[PDB]
Every structure is written in structure tokens, then in C-alpha cells.
């Protein structure tokens, strides 16, 4: 038989059968409710659209994440994304299929029992298993010691392993994301005199933000640079014509990230944290962590960002030690990419968690030790 | 394909007098469309048969199907029948007939110019919506043919007039609608000519005896089944369906007779509605057909709207409306029916683009000022005030069941008798069997049908003195 | 049975029976009365002449109008219109016909509360249904999405529908109409030397507005030619002799269209109330909206209208839209036809007003989800 990778993730579904080189169903996690009446008769409407057909209905729906940070908060929704996941984008009945999912560090037991839950009562998987988003991705980079700093929509983490073995008191978490750093362009952008308030809206904010931004290798230069000149100023295409130019925003939305202060959030940035977790651990394996840095996740895809990460911790790190950052150009399937490889394994096979046990034994069998 | 039908009337004194010949639900989306292993009506090939040269080149007809578009969609030749002297045979038989050469040659140029309809060919105007042809030598020698005007005949294609309270306006029309009145017009002829043929035949058989009470012969197609249903396949099943609901009825009516006549009389309810729960979800309002019909109206439907439709109409709050299932690998299924023969599944694909019969009127009234014979077939086409049905508003499904309708208004005018005919084998070979095509054959005969509402009641019934001399020992 | 589908419109009522490819019935709305004695004794003419007829009659009669703009003001003259429609031009009885009605956006709603009680009590009409003239019209159009443009002789409005959904904050009206334009050219005739004062006349005005008038493509270049040059003067027969000769009049009645301060109207010009439609509808629509731009009634019959519309929105639009603006043959009966479509509909027919749902409900009953 065959296993599916499933990686809910945030604001990205990304699905196929394990053993695949790539995903082969990827497409946005919204859901679209129509928010007028509707006068034409006879063509009935469905009155919730999923998945990627609600980004060509933008203008006529309201579109909800069913997932805020990494947490679950609206369960139909979510049951609504792995519907059309397991039926139309695969078209493959999950009756006969066990299926592996992914989920970040530290999330409350509820929304990993109540998946659990769903997964075997709604669709009735054979069998099903449950991984952090960070060990995938360490296994799809072809390593087995460092640190791995997983940047999604929803939420960042950084975990440490070393020689297979986890270090869970040096898993760091943050709760800023790519999320947050399209509302700040959203909020930025007034200043120019672009109004973006519609939710609709907000997926342009992200492709501005996706296509323009990137990240300074350093700051007050680039400011003063900006200021002086006007080489940095690039324009965009709206989809309703009205090009707009955006200038000194280009690079200040991604500094969020070293600079949490923007938004008012207390944490320290982003190199701070992952220096932090590298002292976190022993002092016998601090070598080897700073030279096995690796980066996943969209948000980390900014041009630039590598050698501004590189240069901080290299700043922060004593002299005398050698920092390398690892970033395939392939970041954001990273996660589903170790996934697969895992589901491949023979000695895999006696991990899954069967129908039969979970109805013996109940829900709680995934936070037992039958992990 | 088409329901033959012949009535032998008879007369006062009870001897035979004469006969009448009528046909009825003739298929016509087989002369357009045509599935990829099956072929088109004969006609066509017989007349691309190379032993007539002169009928070749003088309607300047492409030796090669390939070329044509209508045929070469289908399989282009099989080794079903020498066409060469089956073609020899019909026209001997048209010549020792009653009526002359000139009206042969008429129906060959007629059925020529049905041929090139397929190579027009029209062009979206740069600065307008409306679209207008590119080439004109096809339509330029069928106008010849027809002796009609090319020019005239591609503003009424391009620009129908129509009548709007007392004075004419002009229409607009894109390339898909003027494709598919073309293909209706083409539908329409052939069908025009078929009924004007079967009207000559019988008025040639017609002899001036008295026409007393009748007997009526009906041959229709039986119950067709395939991996690859389709509408036609609906369409004739729907009406198999119909003929064994109507069967059933008469059955049950008979048994009551014999129950009143022995005066052993219970269970009186009726036979009919058990297989009419299936029927009233096709012909009735809301039905298949109807939201078939209603789609093919709305201007952005798509088949997968339709499906759409169909399942949230249907599922669950039918009977006999589910899923469909897949075995074997069969190629696709969309949804599947229960019948009187079994399941049935369906392909939607290519529905909507065939149901649609859009007439032109202006091009009515263009043959009907043609100057050959052809406007005497279209003699006729669209204090009290009716309203008829808009030229637009013309669907294939409607006309079918119209026609049913006609046909059972008749029929169950008559008390009928029934005949069945089963192949033994699908070789030539005698005494053989196949059981699986003798299943089939049983099947869509609705033999078991007869059987299973029997055996619900008291099949066997013996009388007392057989009775008494064959069990009387017991005791 | 068979529904029934009749338009009041405005200046011309068009009838016919549901399911035909145009209204059987064509006739102006028009209530004529004697003002003159009557001397001849035994003819005895009726008090009142309707319809077509009074056209006939027009040089003894005092033409009125039942409607003004879109709203009735003359109850018993729309009571004599329908009884005339239904006896003496379709000959049917409505005690066994549905009625499907078509009215404008943005009445009273007595208007329609007036409308159905007439049509359930005085004539008894099993029942009837109410729609909007701008849905009819994209309908007949074969199009799903744009915005659609209805100006008849009573009000303009504009309309756009995305999709079968409706942006009821977008639908714009105004009030300028054909009945103005007839009205401004009895002004600016005058100062040629024809007067037209009687009611009477405003016929002949109407027909030669209808017969000559056209829409310049530019109007100062057209005045500068028909300041030196003679080539744009025509001349028209009255129903008695002395043709009249017209000249730059001819081009400046449909520019009131796209310049409403030539009689005082302070709103902007239709090309302008068209593109600030589009503009308030939603950013991820208004290229479909561009491109689907449609045109109704029968004001939208002047040659060279789409043309200078055209222009005019490219001027206003940005330069890297396609504007296409569709111009049926058939603009003035778009209307009926949509509404014949509409009522040829099977899922249609549950959403009559019964006459069981009125009696129960009262006449408000119209203002209900059956909309
Ligand atoms: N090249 C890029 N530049 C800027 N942002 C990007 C880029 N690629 C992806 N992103 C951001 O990453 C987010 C997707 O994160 P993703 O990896 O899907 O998280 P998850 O795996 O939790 O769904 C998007 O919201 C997008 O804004
Ligand atoms: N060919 C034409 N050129 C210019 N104006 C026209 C033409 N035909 C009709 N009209 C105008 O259109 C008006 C009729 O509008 P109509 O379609 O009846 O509106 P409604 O649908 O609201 O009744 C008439 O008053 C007439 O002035
Ligand atoms: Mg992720
Ligand atoms: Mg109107």
C-alpha cells in the first residue's frame, strides 16, 4: 500500500503520497463564505467555498483561516480543507490509506486529540501518525545533528537535535510569522496613501509582500540610502490597473523579524532567540550547532536574509567558532519533503497507531508513549 | 434506430383490404455526434460508393471521408455490408416505384448538401462580437445546390430576423450559437426528408379498399446496454423503460380479469407504480430530463454544474437516484439508476452540448422560397390566444418525450400482444449458447420481471380433478 | 399552463407569453381623453381611448401618461393599461396565467404593494412574481458577470452583478431619461423657429428624435463642422407638410446623456456614472467588469453611443484595460426577452407569490426573500 504525507501547516495544504519527490497537491488553506444575497436564479450556489477556487471568487467572498497560530480554532472548517484534500485534489479515498501529519512544538493536547478523533471517526484511516514540523525538515536536509529554525505563516520555532537525540528544554517558540508581517505592510502602507482593509485585499498585501520585500543586510545604511536616493523604489501591478510604488517599506517589513519591537511584541528577535537556544544546550555540542544551521518555511525565503542571520549570529557567537547557514533553495516543501522520506522507511511500519488500538485504548493514545 | 410501425386494416367482412406504415421517435443526435466505435447512418457511406461515378461528380462530392467533418468523427468503415450493391438494390427498388428519377436525384443532392454543412466555418468579428464566415466556396456551392443565394443564406445565418410586435429587428449571433443552429437545421432537414420518404411510401402502398379495425405491428429497440451510456442510450431505455411499465399495467389488468372471473380476488394493488417510481424522475418537473433542459438554458452551465444540481436535487431524496460504482476499470461513471433491467450508469460528459436544437426561422423561410422541392417539406415551421414555443427554447428531450406522449395516446388505444425474440448465441454456429448473452438477452427482455411479479401472488394453479388424480393416493 | 410576461417599462408596455422570442404585444402607454365637445349625435365615442389606438386619434385627445419615472402616479390609467394589455391584445384570460412583472431598483415600496394587490384582487391572477429590469436584461445578454446599463424613456440606472451576486451599494440611478431628451429638443428646436407646445406634437418631436438625432464622437470638432459646413443638415416631412431642415440640433439632444447640465442637472454625465459604479464595487472585480460592460433600452439606441461610451471610459479607465462594451442589435426588447428566459425556467416555478401566500400574508408579503 501506499502512505499520504498530509501537512496542514498554516495558510498552505500540502498533500501527496509518500515515497513522491514533491507534493502534488498544494493550494491555500482559506475558507469563503458569500457575503451578498444573489439575484440570478437557477444557477445554485454552494454556499462555502474551499480551497483554491475561493481565491477566484476573492471578490465576492469573505475568506477565513481555519487555523490562527499553528492551533486549530474553527474544527468544521478545518474538516471542510481535509475533505476537498482527500476528494478532489487527490481524488483518492482515504479508506485504505494511513496518513501522516505534521504539527509545531508545544500546541495545547486538545487540537492533537480532537484531530486524532476526527481523523479516525470521520474519515475512518486505517491508521495515522503524528510528527513535529521540525525533525521532518532536519531529515529532508540529509543531516542528523544541529538546530533547525521552522518560519511559517503561523508561527516560528527553533529546535535543537543532536545525533537524533531532541533537546525539548531548548525548543524555543515565537508567535510571530508571515501573518504578522502582512498585516504590518498592510498597516505600513497607509503611509503612502494605499488603503488596504478587505480581507480580499490582504492576498494582494501578501503578494506585494511575497514578490518585493526582502531583507537588509544592514539597516541605518539602507535607510539612509533610501532617503538620499530613490534607487530602491519599485512599482506593482494592481489587479485593477493603478500602479503603485513602494520605496522605503520595501525592506522594513521583513526586519520584523530581527526587530519585534515594530509591532510591539517583547520578544527578542529572531538571531537572539536562536542564540539563546544554542547556549540552552550542553557546551559539548555547541560546536556542532553553529555549524548546522537550517532554515525552513516560507517566511524565510526573503532574499538577503541568510547573510543578515549569518552576520548576527556571527556577531553574537564568539570569534573562534565557524557559523554556517544551510538554505536550499527548496525551504518551503522542505517540511513535506522529510515527511515522505520518513513515511518511507521500513522501520517506520510499526510506528502507526491502528484503528484497533485507538478504539481499545482511546484518544489519549497519541500522547502516550505509542507516540 | 427509429419505433417502425404498421397497421394491417382489414375489411367489413373480416378480409384484409390494405396497410398503413408510420415511424416514430427517430434519433437524430446520431447525425451529428456519433460515438468513437460506432458510425453514422448508412446513408452516407453508401453514397460515397466509388461505382457511381456520376453522382460523385455532379454534386462535387470529395471522394475521401476523411476530408468531411460530420463522418470522419466516427469509425470510418467497418465490414458490416457491401454497400456497393445494397446502394444498387435501394435505388432498383426507388426506380420500380412509383415516382421518377428526377425526385432520386433530388434526394441524393439534398442529402450531398446536408454533407457540406460541416465545412462552414466562422470568424469572430475584430471590432464586434458578432462573428462572420471566412470562407465561403462551401456554402457558395451548397446555395447552389439548394438554389438558394450564398449571400443571403450567410446574413441569415449571421443576422436572423425575427418578429417582434409588428415590425422585424435583427439578432445577434457569436460562433457557438451559429454552430449549433446550423446543426439543428441540419437535424431538422434529414428528418423532414424522412417523414416526406415514409408519407410517399405509404401513400404508394395505399390501395382503395375500405379501411375497417386494424392490427397494429410495433418494432422498437430493446434495452440497450453499455460500459459508455450516454443520453441516446437514456433516451431509448427511458422508453424500453416506459413500453414494460405499460406491459406490467396489462398484466395486472388481466390478472384481476381472471381473479373476477374464478372469483378468487386479493391483493389488488396495482402493479404500475413500483416501476413508475423510476419514470416520474425523469419525464416529471424537477426531474433529469427537466433539469437537463432547464441547464441547457442558463448561459454559463457546465457539466459540472450540472452534476452539481443533479446531486443536490437527487441524492438521498430519491429512491432511485446514487452513486455510481466503478468495476473493472471502466472508463467513467457519473451517476447510476435502477431499473427493471438493473443498474444503468450514465456519463454526463457531452450532454449539454448535444441536447440543444436551436432552429433558425429565417432560414425557414428561406427554403420556403427556395426553387426546388425542398420547401414542400418545410412547408410549415416556427378569439383565444395561444402561445407557442420560442425558436431558442428548443431542446431535443422535450420532442422525444412529446413524441412518446403521441405514440402512447395511440398504443394504448389497442389491446396488445406481445412477441420476444432471443438470440441463442453471438456465433453463427448452431446449438452453442452463450449464458451471459442469454442473461442479457432475459434481462432487458424483462422476462424476469414477468416471473417476479407472479411469483408474488399464486403462480400455480391446477384444477380439482388433476388435482384428485394425482394426489388423492396421499390420502 | 403557461406564464405570462409583461412589461410596463415606461412610454411603451411589451407583452407576451413566456417561452417566445419576442413580445407579441408592442404598444405606447398612453391614456387618451376628448377635450373637445362632440357634436355629431349617435356615434357615440367612449370617453376614453388606450393604447395604440389613441395614437390614431392623437390630434383630438390630451395624451397622459400613466408613469412619470419608473413610479405609477395615475392608478386608474395603469388599471385601464393592464385591462387593455391582457383583453384586447393577448385576448387571454389572466385568471389561469402566472404574471411575471419587471420593475426598476430603487422605488416605493407602496409601488410594488399597489402592484400586486391590483394584480391579485382586481384581476385575480393565480399568481404573479416581481424582477428587476437590469437582471432580465444581462439574462438576455447570455452573460453571468459586468454591469449592465438600462436606460429607458422613464430612468438609467446601472447595475453590476458578479458571478449571480449582486452589489446593491454599487447600483447607481438617475433620473435623466428619454422623456427629458424629447423635452430638451422641444427647447433647443425653438430657437430655430419651430414651435411644439400641445401634447400632440411631443409625438412628432419623439419621432423625429427617434428618426435623426445621433451621439457625436467629439463635440467641439462636430460644432466647428456644422459651423462651416452644410453637410450635416437634414430634413424631415410633418404629418401635414412644410418639411422642417435640422442641423447641429440634431447631435445636441443625446449629448444631454453625457452633459446633464445642459438642463440643470447638477449629477455627472452616464460615461461617469458608470465608471464610479465600477469603482465602488470591490479591486478583485472590476476587470471582469471592464470587460463586461453592458448596454439595455431603448435610450441606448442612438448610433455612435457605444462608441463615444468607449471612449470616453478608456479616457477614464487606466491604459492597460481592455474596455469592450456590448451593443446587442436588440437593446430595447434586452428586457422582455430576459424575462421570458427567466420565466421558461423549471426552478422557477416554486418561486411564485401564490395566492394562498398573499391572502396569508397580506400585500407586503413582496417584500420577502421572494424579492
Ligand atoms: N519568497 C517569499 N517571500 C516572502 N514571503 C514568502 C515567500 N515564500 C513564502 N512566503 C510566505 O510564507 C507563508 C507560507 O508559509 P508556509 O511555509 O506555508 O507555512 P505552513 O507550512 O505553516 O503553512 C506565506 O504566507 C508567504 O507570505
Ligand atoms: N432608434 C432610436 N433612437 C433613439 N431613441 C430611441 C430609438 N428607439 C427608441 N428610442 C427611445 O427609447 C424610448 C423607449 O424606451 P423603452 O425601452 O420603452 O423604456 P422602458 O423599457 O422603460 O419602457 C422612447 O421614448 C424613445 O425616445
Ligand atoms: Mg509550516
Ligand atoms: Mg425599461
Not at chain 1, 84 to 110: I, S
Not at chain 1, 130 to 147: C, D, E, F, M, N
Not at chain 2, 338 to 352: E, Q, T
Request: aromatic residues 10%; contains cysteine; proline residues 4%.
Amino acid at each position: 500500500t501506499t502512505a499520504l504525507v498530509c501537512d496542514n501547516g498554516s495558510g498552505l495544504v500540502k498533500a501527496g503520497f509518500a515515497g513522491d519527490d514533491a507534493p502534488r497537491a498544494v493550494f491555500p488553506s482559506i475558507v469563503g463564505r458569500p457575503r451578498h444575497q444573489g439575484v440570478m436564479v437557477g444557477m445554485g450556489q454552494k454556499d462555502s467555498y474551499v480551497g483554491d477556487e475561493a481565491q477566484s471568487k476573492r471578490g465576492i467572498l469573505t475568506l477565513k483561516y481555519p487555523i490562527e497560530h499553528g492551533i486549530i480554532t474553527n474544527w468544521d472548517d478545518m474538516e471542510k480543507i481535509w475533505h476537498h484534500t482527500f476528494y478532489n485534489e487527490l481524488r483518492v479515498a482515504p479508506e485504505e490509506h494511513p496518513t501522516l501529519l505534521t504539527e509545531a512544538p508545544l500546541n495545547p493536547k486538545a487540537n492533537r486529540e480532537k484531530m486524532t478523533q476526527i481523523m479516525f471517526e470521520t474519515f475512518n484511516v486505517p491508521a495515522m501518525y503524528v510528527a513535529i514540523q521540525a525533525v521532518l525538515s532536519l531529515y529532508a536536509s540529509g543531516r542528523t545533528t544541529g538546530i533547525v529554525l521552522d518560519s511559517g505563516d503561523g508561527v516560528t520555532h527553533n529546535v535543537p537535535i543532536y545525533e537524533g537525540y531532541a533537546l525539548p528544554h531548548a525548543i524555543m517558540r515565537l508567535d510571530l510569522a508571515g501573518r504578522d508581517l502582512t498585516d504590518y505592510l498592510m498597516k505600513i502602507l497607509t503611509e503612502r496613501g494605499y488603503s488596504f482593509v478587505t480581507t480580499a485585499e490582504r492576498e494582494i498585501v501578501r503578494d506585494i509582500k511575497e514578490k518585493l520585500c526582502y531583507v537588509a543586510l544592514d539597516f541605518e545604511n539602507e535607510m539612509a540610502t533610501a532617503a538620499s536616493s530613490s534607487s530602491l523604489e519599485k512599482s506593482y501591478e494592481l489587479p485593477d490597473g493603478q500602479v503603485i510604488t513602494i520605496g522605503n517599506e520595501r525592506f522594513r517589513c521583513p526586519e520584523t523579524l530581527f526587530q519585534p519591537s515594530f509591532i510591539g511584541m517583547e520578544s527578542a528577535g529572531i538571531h537572539e532567540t536562536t542564540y539563546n537556544s544554542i547556549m540552552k544546550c550542553d557546551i559539548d555540542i555547541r560546536k556542532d550547532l553553529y555549524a548546522n544551521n537550517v532554515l525552513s518555511g516560507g517566511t524565510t525565503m526573503y532574499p538577503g536574509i541568510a547573510d543578515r542571520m549569518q552576520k548576527e549570529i556571527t556577531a553574537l557567537a564568539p570569534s573562534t567558532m565557524k557559523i554556517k547557514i544551510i538554505a536550499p533553495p527548496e525551504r518551503k516543501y522542505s517540511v513535506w519533503i522529510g515527511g515522505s522520506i520518513l513515511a518511507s522507511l521500513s522501520t517506520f511500519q510499526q510506528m502507526w497507531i491502528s484503528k484497533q488500538e485507538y478504539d481499545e485504548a482511546g484518544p489519549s493514545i497519541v500522547h502516550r508513549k505509542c507516540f | 434506430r427509429f419505433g417502425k410501425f404498421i397497421r394491417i386494416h382489414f375489411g367489413a367482412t373480416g378480409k384484409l383490404a390494405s396497410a398503413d406504415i408510420e415511424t416514430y421517435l427517430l434519433e437524430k443526435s446520431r447525425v451529428i455526434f456519433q460515438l468513437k466505435a460506432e458510425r453514422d447512418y448508412h446513408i452516407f457511406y453508401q453514397i460515397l460508393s466509388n461505382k457511381k461515378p456520376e453522382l460523385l461528380d455532379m454534386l462535387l462530392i470529395t471522394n475521401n471521408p476523411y476530408d468531411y467533418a460530420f463522418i470522419s468523427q466516427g469509425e470510418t468503415t467497418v465490414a458490416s455490408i457491401d454497400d456497393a450493391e445494397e446502394l444498387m438494390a435501394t435505388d432498383n427498388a426507388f426506380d420500380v416505384l412509383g415516382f421518377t428519377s428526377e425526385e432520386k436525384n433530388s434526394m441524393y443532392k439534398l442529402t450531398g448538401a446536408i454533407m457540406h454543412f460541416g465545412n462552414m466555418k466562422f470568424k469572430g468579428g475584430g471590432g464586434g462580437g458578432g462573428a462572420e464566415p471566412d470562407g465561403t466556396e462551401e456554402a457558395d456551392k451548397s446555395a447552389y445546390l439548394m438554389g438558394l443565394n450564398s449571400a443571403d443564406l450567410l446574413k441569415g445565418l449571421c443576422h436572423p430576423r425575427v418578429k417582434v410586435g409588428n415590425e422585424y429587428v435583427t439578432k445577434g449571433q457569436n460562433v457557438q450559437q451559429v454552430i449549433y443552429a446550423t446543426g439543428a437545421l441540419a437535424k431538422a432537414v434529414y428528418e423532414r426528408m424522412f417523414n416526406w420518404m415514409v408519407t410517399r411510401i405509404n401513400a404508394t402502398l395505399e390501395t382503395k379498399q375500405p379501411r375497417q379495425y386494424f392490427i397494429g405491428v410495433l418494432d422498437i429497440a430493446g434495452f440497450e446496454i453499455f460500459d459508455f451510456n450516454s443520453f441516446e442510450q437514456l433516451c431509448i431505455n427511458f422508453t424500453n423503460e416506459k413500453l414494460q411499465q405499460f406491459f406490467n399495467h396489462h398484466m395486472f389488468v388481466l390478472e384481476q380479469e381472471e381473479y373476477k372471473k374464478e372469483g378468487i380476488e386479493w391483493t389488488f394493488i396495482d402493479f404500475g407504480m413500483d416501476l413508475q417510481a423510476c419514470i416520474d424522475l425523469i419525464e416529471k418537473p424537477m426531474g433529469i430530463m427537466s433539469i437537463l433542459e432547464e441547464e441547457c438554458m442558463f448561459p454559463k452551465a457546465t457539466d459540472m454544474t450540472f452534476k452539481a444540481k443533479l446531486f443536490d436535487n437527487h441524492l438521498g431524496k430519491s429512491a432511485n437516484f446514487q452513486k455510481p460504482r466503478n468495476i473493472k476499470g471502466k472508463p467513467e461513471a457519473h451517476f447510476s439508476l435502477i431499473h427493471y433491467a438493473g443498474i444503468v450508469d450514465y456519463n454526463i460528459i457531452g450532454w449539454l452540448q448535444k441536447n440543444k436544437d436551436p432552429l433558425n426561422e429565417t432560414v425557414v423561410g428561406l427554403y420556403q422560397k427556395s426553387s426546388l422541392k425542398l420547401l414542400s417539406t418545410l412547408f410549415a415551421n416556427y378569439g383565444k390566444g395561444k402561445a407557442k414555443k420560442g425558436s431558442s427554447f428548443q431542446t431535443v428531450s422535450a420532442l422525444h418525450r412529446e413524441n412518446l406522449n403521441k405514440l402512447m395516446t395511440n398504443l394504448r388505444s389497442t389491446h396488445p400482444h406481445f412477441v420476444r425474440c432471443i438470440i441463442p448465441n453471438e456465433t453463427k454456429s448452431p446449438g452453442v449458447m452463450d449464458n451471459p448473452l442469454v442473461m442479457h438477452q432475459l434481462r432487458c427482455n424483462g422476462v424476469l420481471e414477468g416471473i417476479r411479479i407472479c411469483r408474488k401472488g399464486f403462480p400455480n394453479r391446477i384444477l380439482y380433478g388433476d388435482f384428485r388424480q394425482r394426489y388423492r393416493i396421499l390420502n
